[PDB]
Q: What sequence folds into this?
RNA sequence: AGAAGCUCAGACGAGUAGGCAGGCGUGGAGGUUUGUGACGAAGCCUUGGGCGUGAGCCUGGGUCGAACAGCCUCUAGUG
RNA sequence: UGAAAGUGAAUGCAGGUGGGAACGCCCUGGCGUGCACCAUCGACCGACCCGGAAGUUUGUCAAUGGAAGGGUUUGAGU
RNA sequence: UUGACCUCAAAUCAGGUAGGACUACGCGCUGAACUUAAGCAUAUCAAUAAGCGCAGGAAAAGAAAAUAACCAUGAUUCCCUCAGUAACGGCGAGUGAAGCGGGAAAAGCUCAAAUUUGAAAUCUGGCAACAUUUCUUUUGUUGUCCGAGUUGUAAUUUCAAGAAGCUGCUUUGAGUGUAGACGAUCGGUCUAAGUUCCUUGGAACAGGACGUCAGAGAGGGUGAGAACCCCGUCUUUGGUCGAUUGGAUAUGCCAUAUAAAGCGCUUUCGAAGAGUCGAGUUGUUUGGGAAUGCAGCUCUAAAUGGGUGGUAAAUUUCAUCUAA
């Protein structure tokens, strides 16, 4: 609100907490990001390096949708399934192997961080890492590419 | 590649259909009446001065000079080449 | 002049922005207005549903092609397959999209059975009461205002459940195939040039 | 023993610029108090009394004539 | 993570070491045990510098592809 | 010489129309500076203020010369998101979109380019008849003359097609009453209960006893805090009676399908907008960077041609769309 703020405690104090020797002036140091190479260089160099100059090549008319590729790791593949499917298939030897379509989960690539249980599993995806596939095949499952 | 995101025939394979030909795509096809009318108008009107200049250059066999002049007159080299082939057809037919 | 921690300020407020501030104090009022207009349309348009049937289409990008949404109208090819002429489809509440097309039999069938379900559940009143012509219903006493979504919702493709693992899937290096296809597509242009240059050289 | 309470002991106490904390006062909002009021609310005057370190608060007498306050929270064009 | 093309995180109980909250056992310590946090030594991922094993087909002699392995370089990583 | 026609004039000719005001919101044109960059010239302010023109109840935009690169979407507008992002910037200060996706709302179409050619089938006006009305104030119909129009008005076609053909099913009014019903509608009207006692007071609307009403204890007025004194409030999205309108319904009459239309196959044919597109250039604009749009000047196309695919060029493919 307003009643638990300052300017309710500086009522009576001259200068309102901005000092006498220097005062509260409008823009004594410049407006906005003015500086950065002339008199704000100390703050800019020590707290925002890399701010000035160009790095890299431009891309004209960039569109994010063709680049859309969220990634999921192996340690979340079984959580992508419903609880009933995990109960039916995790740790149980069956002729029919559970399938996870990570694309319907919102993922464009399956990454290999984490461990995967020993039960066989079918992973349907667009992209996959090299050792992500190695662990899936190690766990007895297969990776099928989706497009 | 079919059904593999990357490759040459990338993408999902879902049978195939033969789309009907849209009448708008027929635009650009030369019609019988249009060909007849344009022949009449060409006889009635003739050629522009730059068309005449190009035809003389083609007659004197400065093909590169005629091509460069037509590009200068029309703006693009594609339209220049089309005009050269149009005007050399006129030359061949008149010799016939 | 910027001495505190945090990111460098980026406030695009150097124009006369107070002149063009837009407030939403009429948000509840507009919501009630849209409700009243919707109910006015519902009562005025008779038994006819307040929303026309829409086709099931797929959004055009890799980010969204795995989903099914509602389209604008049914294509002329779909209407012909369902047996409805484009002249009567607009009259009986079937939108027409002359721009769309059926590049796949799957999209064609998807919307054809949608029209077939709509036609089966549609009660068409005779133009003159008591004189049923072709397509006209014989009884219209039970006519009601129903929801097209309830009668025919947009259905999403559901991934099949567990399936057996075959040996051709077992003997399939997914990562190597991905790398090989990417490289094959990358250098296909150079291969075409090399095959050309070889031909004239030979 | 309003445990957010009670109790015991020791050391200590200057301060501009400035920081922090707990309080006093004002207008409006929610709750509350069987709240005060034409048998005199609010306001105002006072060589009367009382409380608090203080911001302040209460009260006697006078004037006056229609409304106003305590507490818990909300808020601000609040000294 | 890199400018990008792209690639993309467990040798180990998700490692050692030092100090450490709380606990347990013993006679104040000792002994275990070690959360949190720092010091530090590694391991892994991406760049960078090498190294080119398969494998893919197209040029098989090649074209393309990148594995193991090494740097003590780097990242706003695991 | 008379005539026809063309062009250009006149009339206080017959009948119409325009201005001005308003301008919050709409479409344009024209167009700064203070300001910021700690100076300042590009830049920023700002495609803003001032100036000028022209609209409406909304305007503008709008049925792709649109996206995308997908398993593809599908007029326009607005919202959220994209996104403070791609990009532009003395790459400084700063500036800065779009496709997708979710929603609100949805609606589609009309000409030009066709020989009706066995029939200008088209239309303004004068006159006279009828009819009609929010209306003696409004809006038409039929007949008959004069004209307009072949230097092209109707019918038919709009690329999503279509047009001519080939049989064969299917479909059909730009109508008029009248009756009653069912809805909407400004408006005239209709509406419960203490003013009983005591105390204070100038006044009871206060305080206290005793009640009442309540689908009405909103709010006012009345000599001080009034549900019961008065207007109102609730019932009320309603009874009422007086006119209006709407979509159906009952039949009445008029209607020449001698017509028209959808659909289906064509061994077929398929007209598709020019000082415009495009190019160069100079300004001005944009986030558009080897020009994003617009404008001026110069040059000026084409016929599967022309656009566009956000790095200029030549070339070759592919999508998409079909401008003037």
A:
């Amino acid at each position: 609100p307003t009643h638990v703020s300052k300017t309710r405690k500086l009522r009576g104090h001259v200068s309102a907490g901005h000092g006498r020797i220097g005062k509260h002036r409008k823009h004594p140091g410049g407006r906005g990001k003015a500086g950065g190479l002339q008199h704000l260089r100390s703050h800019f160099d020590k707290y925002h390096p890399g701010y000035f100059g160009k790095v890299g090549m431009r891309r004209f008319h960039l569109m994010k949708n063709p680049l859309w590729r969220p990634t999921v790791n192996l340690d979340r593949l079984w959580t992508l399934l419903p609880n009933e499917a995990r109960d039916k298939y995790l740790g149980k030897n069956t002729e029919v192997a559970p399938v996870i379509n990570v694309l319907q989960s919102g993922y464009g690539k399956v990454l290999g961080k984490g461990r995967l249980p020993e039960t066989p599993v079918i992973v349907q995806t667009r992209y996959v890492s090299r050792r992500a596939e190695e662990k899936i095949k190690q766990a007895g499952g297969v990776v099928e590419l989706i497009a | 590649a079919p059904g593999l995101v990357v490759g040459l025939n990338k993408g999902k394979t879902l049978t195939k259909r033969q789309l009907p030909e849209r009448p708008s795509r027929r635009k650009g096809h030369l019609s019988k009446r249009t060909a007849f009318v344009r022949s009449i108008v060409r006889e009635v009107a003739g050629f522009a001065p730059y068309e005449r200049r190009v035809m003389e250059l083609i007659r004197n066999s400065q093909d590169k000079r005629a091509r460069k002049l037509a590009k200068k007159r029309l703006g693009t080299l594609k339209r220049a080449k089309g005009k050269i082939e149009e005007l050399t057809s006129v030359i061949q037919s008149s010799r016939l | 002049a910027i001495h505190v921690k945090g990111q460098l300020p980026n406030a695009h407020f150097h124009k006369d922005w107070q002149r063009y501030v837009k407030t939403w104090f009429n948000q509840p009022g507009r919501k009630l207005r849209r409700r009243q207009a919707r109910q006015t349309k519902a009562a005025k348009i008779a038994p006819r549903p307040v929303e026309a049937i829409r086709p099931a289409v797929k959004p055009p990008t890799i980010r969204y092609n795995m989903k099914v949404r509602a389209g604008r109208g049914f294509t002329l090819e779909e209407l012909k397959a369902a047996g409805v002429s484009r002249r009567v489809a607009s009259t009986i509440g079937i939108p027409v999209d002359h721009r769309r097309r059926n590049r796949s039999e799957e999209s064609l069938q998807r919307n054809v059975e949608r029209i077939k379900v709509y036609l089966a559940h549609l009660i068409v009143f005779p133009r003159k009461a008591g004189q049923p012509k072709k397509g006209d219903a014989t009884d219209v006493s039970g006519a009601e205002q129903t929801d097209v979504a309830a009668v025919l919702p947009i259905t999403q493709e559901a991934v099949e459940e567990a399936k057996p693992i075959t040996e051709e899937a077992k003997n399939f290096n997914a990562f190597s195939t991905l790398s090989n296809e990417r490289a094959y597509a990358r250098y296909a242009g150079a291969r075409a040039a090399f095959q050309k240059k070889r031909a004239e050289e030979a």
